[PDB]
Design an enzyme around this catalytic site. Structure first.
Site, PDB file in Angstrom:
ATOM      1  CB  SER A 164      -0.933   0.017   1.213  1.00  0.00           C
ATOM      2  OG  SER A 164      -0.212   0.276   2.405  1.00  0.00           O
ATOM      3  CD  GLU A 177      -0.680 -11.966 -26.139  1.00  0.00           C
ATOM      4  OE1 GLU A 177      -1.248 -10.933 -26.549  1.00  0.00           O
ATOM      5  OE2 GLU A 177       0.044 -12.681 -26.867  1.00  0.00           O
TER       6      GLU A 177
HETATM    7  N1  LIG Z   1      -9.589 -19.154 -35.043  1.00  0.00           N
HETATM    8  C1  LIG Z   1      -8.599 -19.689 -34.332  1.00  0.00           C
HETATM    9  N2  LIG Z   1      -7.487 -18.931 -34.020  1.00  0.00           N
HETATM   10  C2  LIG Z   1      -6.469 -19.461 -33.293  1.00  0.00           C
HETATM   11  C3  LIG Z   1      -6.544 -20.779 -32.859  1.00  0.00           C
HETATM   12  N3  LIG Z   1      -5.419 -21.056 -32.168  1.00  0.00           N
HETATM   13  C4  LIG Z   1      -4.635 -19.956 -32.155  1.00  0.00           C
HETATM   14  N4  LIG Z   1      -5.274 -18.953 -32.838  1.00  0.00           N
HETATM   15  C5  LIG Z   1      -4.733 -17.597 -33.050  1.00  0.00           C
HETATM   16  O1  LIG Z   1      -3.700 -17.365 -32.110  1.00  0.00           O
HETATM   17  C6  LIG Z   1      -3.822 -16.097 -31.502  1.00  0.00           C
HETATM   18  C7  LIG Z   1      -3.448 -16.186 -30.029  1.00  0.00           C
HETATM   19  O2  LIG Z   1      -2.067 -16.424 -29.863  1.00  0.00           O
HETATM   20  P1  LIG Z   1      -1.491 -17.921 -29.707  1.00  0.00           P
HETATM   21  O3  LIG Z   1      -2.583 -18.922 -29.993  1.00  0.00           O
HETATM   22  O4  LIG Z   1      -0.909 -18.132 -28.330  1.00  0.00           O
HETATM   23  O5  LIG Z   1      -0.346 -18.028 -30.836  1.00  0.00           O
HETATM   24  P2  LIG Z   1       1.184 -17.711 -30.445  1.00  0.00           P
HETATM   25  O6  LIG Z   1       1.238 -16.493 -29.554  1.00  0.00           O
HETATM   26  O7  LIG Z   1       2.041 -17.528 -31.673  1.00  0.00           O
HETATM   27  O8  LIG Z   1       1.652 -19.006 -29.610  1.00  0.00           O
HETATM   28  P3  LIG Z   1       2.001 -20.380 -30.371  1.00  0.00           P
HETATM   29  O9  LIG Z   1       0.926 -20.644 -31.398  1.00  0.00           O
HETATM   30  O10 LIG Z   1       2.052 -21.515 -29.375  1.00  0.00           O
HETATM   31  O11 LIG Z   1       3.337 -20.252 -31.060  1.00  0.00           O
HETATM   32  C8  LIG Z   1      -5.269 -15.669 -31.677  1.00  0.00           C
HETATM   33  O12 LIG Z   1      -5.344 -14.314 -32.051  1.00  0.00           O
HETATM   34  C9  LIG Z   1      -5.806 -16.550 -32.786  1.00  0.00           C
HETATM   35  O13 LIG Z   1      -6.055 -15.789 -33.943  1.00  0.00           O
HETATM   36  C10 LIG Z   1      -7.659 -21.547 -33.170  1.00  0.00           C
HETATM   37  O14 LIG Z   1      -7.727 -22.715 -32.789  1.00  0.00           O
HETATM   38  N5  LIG Z   1      -8.686 -20.999 -33.907  1.00  0.00           N
END
Ligand SMILES: Nc1nc2c(ncn2[C@@H]2O[C@H](COP(=O)(O)OP(=O)(O)OP(=O)(O)O)[C@@H](O)[C@H]2O)c(=O)[nH]1
Ligand SMILES: Nc1nc2c(ncn2[C@@H]2O[C@H](COP(=O)(O)OP(=O)(O)OP(=O)(O)O)[C@@H](O)[C@H]2O)c(=O)[nH]1
Lengths: 440, 453, 441
Positions: free
Chosen positions: A141, A255
């Site tokens: 705090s 993030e």
């Molecule tokens: N529509 C869709 N988008 C996905 C999916 N999996 C990952 N994404 C995309 O991935 C983004 C989120 O980041 P991550 O999934 O962690 O991808 P990254 O940060 O490169 O991490 P890694 O894939 O493990 O290398 C989102 O904005 C999605 O667009 C999925 O199963 N469906």
């Protein structure tokens, strides 16, 4: 990028840590015995969670990694009398015989460094016990000068030791209307300067705003510090739900570090949580996603004595605990964009981060909470933070003009030069935030 | 001229789409999840050809010729636990580097270049295990910074490691990018390498994906698994021409011969009728469409998988593949109806191409309402608008240089000026690409050779 | 040859539901849309192609589109005929329930969401090749219905100038809402004068009277009125739905009935029918059709000036009785000295796939006429409109869009409507006289 070292500094910080550990135990249904609690929870015990904050030993007993540092023996005896000490380790908790000063004068003195060395080697041993690291969590705090100074010292030492993982610092801001201690604004400004020096992400939460919330939303006649601690625990749990439990759209601490920092120097996000109301209002009817998104922007839920309507919108995040439809929140955020409650900018406005977690919220028995299957915690970036800063800075300016106590500070461990530096740096931060916000 | 193709799963989205594609292929070829073929090894007669996509280690087990590479081991462990013995544990790359330290293409390329030796050794081992090879298929998942960086590193290695092989890539674009700055930066940095080295690239915008998932499915909430199932079915349909070899198109090279007029124009737009192999495929016998209606739906913007934004779209190469009992007279009628409705450039008299494939004898036969399905791939400059979205984001954010403290680490450049120059070069590259597209949209593109002879 | 039904308003939805149920019961289609006929015999004498699209499942989807600002009646029709209509042929404007019974709001909604209706009708046309025109079913009294009808009429005349359009307009009865519904009626009438090709008029008061006379319960329902409308539409379309030797399209019917596009309003009649014995021969049927107590419109004339009449008789008829009734009709009905005394009789075959209607073996007959009763109805409507307009200025308080931006243009449009309907009634009363064709005689 899995372990997060949480530190509880000062009396209020130790109380907040106790509340957060109690809420983490209540969400997973964890009792002092455990073994996870028990070793068949799936996923209330290993694997994650708990593996982000609770270190796992050979016997399976989860140990909440927290460093309870304080120079007041009363708070240490209080936290040792409870089962939390049995959950913790005696070497992780540090004891202090005499309080530093009133309050920040000796909080950053050499007596602070004597304990800094010990807690540094303890943190090194703890990191050797676990594998990987995601970030450093801080809970202290700003009203308590000793706790704020010790937290700033821990932050500086951790930045000078590793400097690899981002440092998260939850700062409890006092009531801008009334100040219990006369040295409170000085310590607040000095701690804000130290965070600007060695913090990558901060948090601003006001106590008067929480009191007004629990008086208006929860409808309690006598607000206590336990209710504020439980609300802070709920806030921290809503933030770290995506790391404790899995969801449809999991988010990482990196993030958060990217979202909350859209400029070279932007690390001051505000927190809001919705819906927070009495139990009778939830028993009567149930709200929709649009109502919760509208209440997220209300001045009460902002947890700060400032109005966000006059502020300017920047990159914000919204984490949704519980069963949440993506199309519903998309329509809700589109409706909020159409309403234009907060004024947008030319760079951020298309920055509504949307994270989802399957873990539903939990209502603590001490503090009332609206029993809803979907909760929303919003990390916003508004320019009314600069307005609260300017208010507290005018207060500090009037004080430092008179301040009635300069000789004690310039004789014990400080000087007028440090106060002037902190004042100038705070004013520079305020005007820089104003100029980077109103540049649109 | 038909060769084997090796699958390259990269990133979380890439791994999910790869797992869904392999499950769909196993369901089609009656292979299953356990890895061992559900069909007995006595009935050796098979109309399909799993050899280009499955390695025949034994007579009853078909190991998919695929390699997964990701930084998050959780999804890889989940896929391996779900598919017991189906995938190859030696083709799983995690590098023991832990979770990704951000969503930056710089960190992605760094984690790719650091363990580039391991992935190249695995590729060489797969090449030594196989006998024939034609090219790779990479899943970028450009929405993720680490995945896009890994895909760009894989492409930058493969281009100068195997120049005799054709490279096809699948870039999944999001509907509404949450962090517009980071996602635009990653997509532009991946598009740079796509222009430089990639031979063919298929884009997948999530807007139309979510639209179709909300329309054809009953549940209002959309899940990423059955969202990627759509791209899984699309890849299955486009690889059907090699799995079940047709009589007109029997090799990926021959398909890309007519799909790609020039290496500069290597970005397509897909479209598919209401699917029949997805989860909620019961609402398909109420339409009762023929091949002409299937072609109409393929040419309709509501069935495309990318942002259409059809404002007088210029077509260059339109191709369609129809699977099922197709009628030649109905195909002729559909072609006559489409040649008077599809805009064609005046400089090239090339019309749309039609191919008829064969249905699997083990797949669940659909009623006469939706027993025949179709896929369409068209060379349209409408993807230039999806790119211009990110280009406008770059132009409106690059005025200050936001998020410069994230792309400076990992990559070979730690200073701000070098990263700024690299981003400006990539922006200029994508600008020149869009200029080439808007120039090819006109008739002067073919006149560029007529004016000097 | 294919005609697309256009169901405008809740009245249009009701009459379309009733007509499609009647056609399904006639051609053995049922509510499920599947062919109720066995698959062993494909020889059929009817014609379901212009009204029903047969899919691969042998299901006959009705070629009808419902345009209404009230989705409740459309949902009720869909629930009553689940598996019959196509959900893609449904149009509710995506604006919620109806609001305001003025023509202005209806026309504004039509002009706003015309793109969806245009795409729907384009898809319905491209589904087939042989096309002749559309079929509209609406009430001139309903504001939203009249607005949607005018919008679709404008779209049809400025998009397909080669497709003949026929509509069925049911005029309101003597009630209170005629102080405001008369505005919509005269606006729809002006639109019909401008762009329509054929119109069949109906009077609500006469329909209620005829239904109360033929029924035992005097509490006549709107559903009963819609059933009567379905029956008269089926009787007038039987010649197209069962073409054998002479009549195979509405083109010849409108050629022999409508002499000029300026006179394109027809009055129907049909008798006898139920909605169980035989007591009326063909001569009795024809004299009942001539009698005003069997017409679907209020005659209000001692001897109307018949211009063109055409009747379709359903049942086994004798040429001797046909000739006797024709001679009696020629002796009774007076024809103008400039137009010919043409009387056409079409023997319509009965549907063998239709359940036997009550009063079996009773020959029936429909008759479409062009006389001076439609002009009396139009004169009553225009007189009521003129009275309410010149006496009370309240129409300038309920307008939408351009009609609400300024009330002067609304008054100008209503004055133009009054002028065009006055020119229409003047042309009609001039054609009533023998001096109409004096320019060439
Ligand atoms: N529509 C869709 N988008 C996905 C999916 N999996 C990952 N994404 C995309 O991935 C983004 C989120 O980041 P991550 O999934 O962690 O991808 P990254 O940060 O490169 O991490 P890694 O894939 O493990 O290398 C989102 O904005 C999605 O667009 C999925 O199963 N469906
Ligand atoms: N005979 C008959 N007429 C009907 C029926 N339903 C509606 N109508 C007509 O509708 C008129 C009354 O106005 P509304 O019912 O409000 O029609 P509207 O103004 O177009 O409003 P909406 O129907 O909701 O679009 C009457 O004068 C009738 O002519 C019906 O079931 N039978």
């Amino acid at each position: 990028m899995r372990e997060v070292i949480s530190i509880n500094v000062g009396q209020a910080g130790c109380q907040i840590g106790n509340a957060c550990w109690e809420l983490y135990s209540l969400e997973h249904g964890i009792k002092p015995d455990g073994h996870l609690e028990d070793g068949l929870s799936k996923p209330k015990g290993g694997e994650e969670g708990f593996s982000t904050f609770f270190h796992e030993t050979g016997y399976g007993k989860f140990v909440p990694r927290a460093i309870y540092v304080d120079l007041e023996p009363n708070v240490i005896d209080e936290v040792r009398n409870g089962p939390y000490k049995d959950l913790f380790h005696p070497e992780q908790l540090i004891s202090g015989k005499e309080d530093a000063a009133n309050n920040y004068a000796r909080g950053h003195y050499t007596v602070g460094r004597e304990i800094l060395g010990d807690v540094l080697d303890r943190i090194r041993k703890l990191a050797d016990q676990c594998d990987g690291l995601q970030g450093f969590l801080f809970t202290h705090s700003l009203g308590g000068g000793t706790g704020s100074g010790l937290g700033s010292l821990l932050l500086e030492e951790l930045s000078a030791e590793y400097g690899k993982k981002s440092k998260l610092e939850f700062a409890v801001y006092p009531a801008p209307q009334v100040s219990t201690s006369v040295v409170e604004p000085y310590n607040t400004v000095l701690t804000t300067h130290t965070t600007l020096e060695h913090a990558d992400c901060t948090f601003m939460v006001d106590n008067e705003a929480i009191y007004d919330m629990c008086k208006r939303n929860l409808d309690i006649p006598r607000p206590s510090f336990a209710n504020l601690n439980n609300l802070i625990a709920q806030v921290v749990s809503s933030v770290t739900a995506s790391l404790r439990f899995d969801g449809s759209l999991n988010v990482d601490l990196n993030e958060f570090q990217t979202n909350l920092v859209p400029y070279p120097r932007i690390h001051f996000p505000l927190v809001s949580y919705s819906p927070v109301l009495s139990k009778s209002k939830a028993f009567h009817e149930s709200n929709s996603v649009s109502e919760i998104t509208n209440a997220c922007f209300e001045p009460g839920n902002q947890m700060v004595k400032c109005d966000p309507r006059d502020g300017k919108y920047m990159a914000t995040c919204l984490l949704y605990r519980g069963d949440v439809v993506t199309r519903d929140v998309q329509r809700a955020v589109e409706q909020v964009k159409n309403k234009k409650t907060v004024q947008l900018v030319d760079w951020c406005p298309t920055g509504f981060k949307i994270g989802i977690c399957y873990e539903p919220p939990t209502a603590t028995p001490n503090s009332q909470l609206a029993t809803v299957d979907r909760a929303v915690c919003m990390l916003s970036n508004t320019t009314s933070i600069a307005e609260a800063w300017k208010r507290i800075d005018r207060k500090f300016d009037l004080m430092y003009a008179k301040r009635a106590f300069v000789h004690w500070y310039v004789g014990e461990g400080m000087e007028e030069g440090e106060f002037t530096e902190a004042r100038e740096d705070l004013a520079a931060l305020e005007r820089d935030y104003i100029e980077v916000g109103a540049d649109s | 001229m038909g060769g084997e193709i090796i699958t390259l799963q990269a990133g979380q989205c890439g791994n999910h789409v790869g797992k869904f594609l392999w499950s769909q292929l196993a369901k089609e070829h009656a292979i299953g999840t356990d890895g061992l073929s559900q069909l007995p090894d006595s009935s050796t007669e098979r109309d399909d050809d799993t050899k280009p996509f499955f390695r025949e280690n034994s007579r009853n087990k078909f190991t998919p010729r695929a390699i997964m590479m990701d930084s998050e081991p959780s999804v890889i462990a989940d896929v391996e636990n779900t598919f017991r013995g189906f995938f190859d544990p030696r083709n799983t790359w995690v590098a023991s580097d832990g979770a990704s330290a951000g969503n930056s293409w710089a960190n992605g390329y760094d984690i790719g270049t650091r363990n580039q030796d391991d992935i190249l050794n695995k590729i060489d081992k797969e090449i030594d295990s196989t006998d024939n090879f034609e090219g790779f298929q990479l899943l970028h998942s450009v929405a993720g910074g680490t995945g896009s960086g890994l895909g760009s590193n894989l492409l930058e290695a493969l281009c100068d490691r195997y120049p005799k092989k054709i490279l096809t890539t699948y870039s999944v674009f999001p509907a509404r990018s949450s962090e517009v700055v980071v996602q635009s930066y990653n997509t532009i940095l991946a598009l740079r390498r796509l222009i430089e080295d990639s031979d063919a690239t298929v884009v997948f915008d999530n807007a139309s994906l979510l639209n179709i998932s909300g329309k054809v499915f009953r549940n209002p909430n959309i899940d990423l698994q059955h969202t990627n199932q759509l791209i899984s079915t699309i890849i299955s349909s486009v690889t059907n021409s090699i799995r079940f070899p047709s009589y007109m198109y029997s090799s990926m090279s021959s398909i890309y011969s007519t799909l790609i007029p020039s290496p500069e124009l290597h970005f397509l737009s897909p479209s598919f009728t209401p699917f029949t192999s997805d989860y909620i495929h019961d609402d398909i016998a109420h339409k009762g469409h023929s091949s002409y209606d299937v072609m109409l739906d393929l040419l309709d913007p509501s069935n495309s998988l990318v942002s259409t934004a059809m404002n007088n779209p210029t077509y260059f190469n339109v191709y369609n593949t129809i699977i099922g009992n197709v009628e030649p007279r109905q195909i002729s009628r559909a072609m006559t109806k489409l040649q008077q409705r599809i805009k064609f450039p005046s400089w090239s008299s090339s019309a749309m191409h039609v191919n008829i494939g064969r249905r699997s004898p083990y797949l669940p036969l659909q009623p006469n309402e939706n027993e025949v399905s179709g896929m369409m791939l068209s060379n349209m400059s409408t993807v230039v608008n999806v790119f211009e979205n990110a280009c406008n984001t770059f132009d409106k954010v690059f005025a200050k240089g936001a998020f410069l403290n994230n792309y400076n680490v990992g990559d070979l450049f730690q200073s701000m000026q070098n990263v700024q120059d690299e981003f400006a070069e990539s922006r200029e590259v994508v600008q020149s690409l869009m200029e080439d597209y808007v120039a090819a949209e006109q008739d002067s593109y073919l006149d560029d050779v007529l004016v000097d002879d």
